[PDB]
């Protein structure tokens, strides 16, 4: 009913480890993800011993805990399965090419301790390999500066999981068709008729708006300006410039200046591919 | 089991403070936001002392409370972590440029007290800086006139958080492309052919409706008339006026009055940019 | 632990009142709204006296109750805060111009009573003025005929809140742009070219379908035929009639009958504004 | 604390009845509907007698029960209000014209009984008339063959509610505008110009896709092939055939065969109304 | 209160079986499905005997359990109804033609056992036949290598349900109309006019984007590249190639090279049907 009294040091290094079991959800819009796994505590029946009530910080509602096995040994092991939605922000600074770092902050209440880690206990389960994500590093750090509101010194032993998106699907499902729509838009330049070029640019503008609807159905729409948030803006800019160019060409052609009209057509034709590649490169450099 | 009896004054100024931890959600459509933070009470084990059961007013369902640390001293500190969705209305009177003030009304039940504040305890955590929002002021006021239904005098010590939106993304993701669509619409004026101008205005009207779909996916659609709710209406007005102008121009051109047709084209061309800027300025002045 | 025995009359008129605090939600699609307020009971510590367990009828799940103040006096007052989603149907017979009446049916279990009201206790809080709605009347009625399944005579003392929508936003955000789309559609009549009139009517039909998408994002889509459900149908009817008229005009023009073609154009031009106004008036009279 | 021992027959015919109060929701997409009503048990204070714990089969999560009145008589009545989402599948074999039968399977645990019904107790409340639905029959059947996993003989006394949709709104809000779009599509036939007929058919194909979006916002999208799932397919078929017909007509007209072109136009004009009516009749006969 | 002590073997083969009752939901987007059925345990009143607390692994939140019948015999049967959302991933590698295998991992806590199966007890209920799915096999395997974090040897006796989609609706509701849109797109080739072919290809590109919206409303959008994720990409590729082909044809026709223009038209006309069939066959072979 009480922690083991006799020790010269006030804190006890109870080995705390976590091993993933199944990431039930990764809610981008809710900005949190639901994790369902079990944690192991080594402290050296539900009330067989004094269980250090190690709590969590980044938690929506009190973790759905369930003791699995509390083994004793001439120390004690304690593995408990739990499900909890962790309120870890993830910055969609680069949505199709991300390096999001999921955090779990574990803090232990103190009476009459200090959290620790176990190298063997921790580790993502190979059979629990995540769907659509890749794991780069899975470490733990004892940083006591995480919280400063409480006067008493407390150290939060957080777990960091660096995760990068599998991006071999987004290139052929989101980014590339926008380029195809833009390419159809440019193909208006080689044509001549106003009555055809106008529809071939504005109908494809309809196409781009609808396609942005299609992507938005999946995107989380962070308040930042995403890398997607810039390529979309660049495409709107280029559609506006293309409509301006075709209108100028027709204005010259009706005002009997065909030479400058042809010059503008040639310049735009050899420019927009080049200037768009340059602009995309500039945005990539800014979002490297 | 009882509050400390001997004091000449019926109320005790138990220091009540709150420090944010993680704003789990800001649900515009639900008109509430979910806050997960811990509150500290200074009153001068779960049942170690008499905990003043300070309750909240703006709460959906009873706050998910969890005691963190109840320290005693030769007064007593009591820090408790809690998660609660606060039912604080926020007026989207100016959606892209807002100054919304989140409220939390704390009231203490009285038997045989008066809420107070602690300057040091309160304060937004720097590491808990919100995503997509900026904090202007974080104050507390003891206003007993908040509720008048109960005859007994009670004072609600509310916390006010003034928050303004980071608007460097909405200008390049919502407002500006609508202007680009409208600009493409105007570019029909310099043209001449009816069979081209008609499609160049109505196809871009399709574009504007679809783009309003794209924004609506994000907007909360308050029953007010938002600043967005006016610019959208103004754009529909200008598309209707543009279609009227082009139809009149063609009606004159087929009725053999080319001079007035050219006059109308020139007037509209030099007018709609100017009149639209004037109208947007007028709406801005009305929504300053 | 027992109700006060000695009284010649079996029921006791415990004064029951409710004062709104914050209408947390008004879910049109769910057909229920979530109310968070406190109720006061005057019956002449949680177990200080015998609390008449007055229950509710229109409740999704058992009300989230919380006692606030149970005061005693040489009678007893009992104010309790609660949150509950009330399953009160609201008929969207006229969506932009509604008079929906929210109901709350309170019934008291009887052993060894009769519900009552307090004029002073009841009343909407001025600071709790609802967002996007207006209150016309807030009354209470003791109608024992509400339920007849139980043989024992019981009276349900329901509270009625008559609420009408603020409609100064829907006219400039929903109804009017549909009229603008229809007006653009009509503007095809003054034109002559088939290749232009066809696109100017069917592209704007695209516009109307997309705009109905935009409204549907907000509408609840009741199984009735709403007033919106009729104006939409009327607009589809008028687009079909307009396409029929333009096709007939072109069929006559290619069949070398220009006189009747011009006659039909003039008739339709002077008719559709008039006949549409008449039809909208007829629908308004039917939905007065 | 125990059932009444002395009776020669092991089961007791405790009269079980249900009367609806408010169908809180009918979730098509979730394939379940939430019912909030009270059930009455006649068995011949919460622990006043032995309450036969009659449970339900088609239940998502344990029914939210609440005892209302347990009356005793020199038998005993027991009316309890409850809210529960019942997992009753409903087959959208004919979405606009359905005859869906909602089921509620009640089974009584046996120790040391047999469920029964009461004609007077059961019955839909007239004031609880459902919104957008009509009730055809409300019966109860004791069919012990419902479940066979348990060796011990048990009879499930299910309640059946036959409900048919009010279809006076779907004809003027879903089915008819699709016909109007198709009619606009056909009106291309009487025209002659390719540059006009092509847009008048494919723009209206855009219209049909968008309108299917509008309906899909409401439909549940069952994995069957609905009657809607066939009319939609038929409309796509007819748009494809119409585009084929107009392309063939233009191919003949440019290949200098105007006679066969006119013949094809006349044949299609007099055919597609007739063949579409025949095809819709065939689908109706298949889905009678 | 304790397991039956005297047995030479530490584990007891308590027969564990599950029989489905109603699959309440199959949430593709949530990647989990909600099952509501009852499980039977044969171990050789709630506390009549020692119930082996067999827990589950793939569970969102602790299973909503409810004991149904705990029968004793001179062994003991124990049937308990439960509802639980199982976190079983399903790979949408082939969305319209899938072979998804739902898993349920059952593990028994050990003190002072080994899970087993019963051939008769297990089995899908015929009256509980799933809606929109077909069952191929329903087996159980004792594989102790499922989890390796715990040092103590434990065997998880998982149940596997192989389920394949009824695909007689997706072919006539999703795949085929995309082919119809593409066919309308190709029908532009036989035509000649640029002003007509351009609209007949880009308007139908609008159609394809909107139709992808319609399908996306139903699809779960897995991060893989689905078979749908390839046919969609192929259709965008073919629209881009078709626009390129028509623009090249018009560029040649205005540059006075009609012979090569006609040659390109004929080649594309006889190619795109053939090359598209070949490409779809190649994708099918890759996704066999």
Author numbering:
A (entry chain C), B (entry chain B), C (entry chain A), D (entry chain E), E (entry chain D): 5 to 48, 67 to 96, 99 to 136, 140 to 315
What's written in the study?
Pentameric ligand-gated ion channels are major mediators of fast synaptic transmission in the mammalian nervous system and serve a variety of biological roles across evolution. The extracellular domain (ECD) of each subunit contains β-strands β1–β10, with the characteristic Cys- or Pro-loop connecting β6–β7, and loops A–F enclosing a canonical ligand-binding site at the interface between principal and complementary subunits. The transmembrane domain (TMD) contains α-helices M1–M4, with M2 lining the channel pore, and an intracellular domain of varying length (2–80 residues) inserted between M3 and M4. GLIC has been thoroughly documented as a proton-gated ion channel, conducting currents in response to low extracellular pH with half-maximal activation around pH 5 (8).
To characterize the resting state of the prokaryotic pentameric channel GLIC, we first obtained single-particle cryo-EM data under resting conditions (pH 7), resulting in a map to 4.1 Å overall resolution. Local resolution was between 3.5 and 4.0 Å in the TMD, including complete backbone traces for all four transmembrane helices. Side chains in the TMD core were clearly resolved, including a constriction at the I233 hydrophobic gate (I9′, 2.9 Å Cβ-atom radius), consistent with a closed pore. Whereas some extracellular regions were similarly well resolved, local resolution in the ECD was generally lower, with some atoms that could not be definitively built in the β1–β2 loop, β8–β9 loop (loop F), and at the apical end of the ECD. At pH 7, K248 at the loop midpoint oriented down toward the M2 helix, where it could form an intrasubunit hydrogen bond with E243. In simulations of the pH-7 structure under deprotonated conditions, the K248 side chain was attracted down in each subunit towards the negatively charged E243; similar to the starting structure, these residues formed an electrostatic contact in >70% of trajectory frames. These environmental ions were not coordinated by other protein motifs in a rigid binding site, potentially explaining poorly resolved densities in this region in neutral-pH structures. The apparent resting state (pH 7) was characterized by relatively low reconstructed resolution and flexibility in the ECD, particularly at the domain interface and peripheral surfaces, potentially conferring entropic favorability. (A) Cartoon of the GLIC resting state, corresponding to a deprotonated closed conformation, as represented by the predominant cryo-EM structure at pH 7.
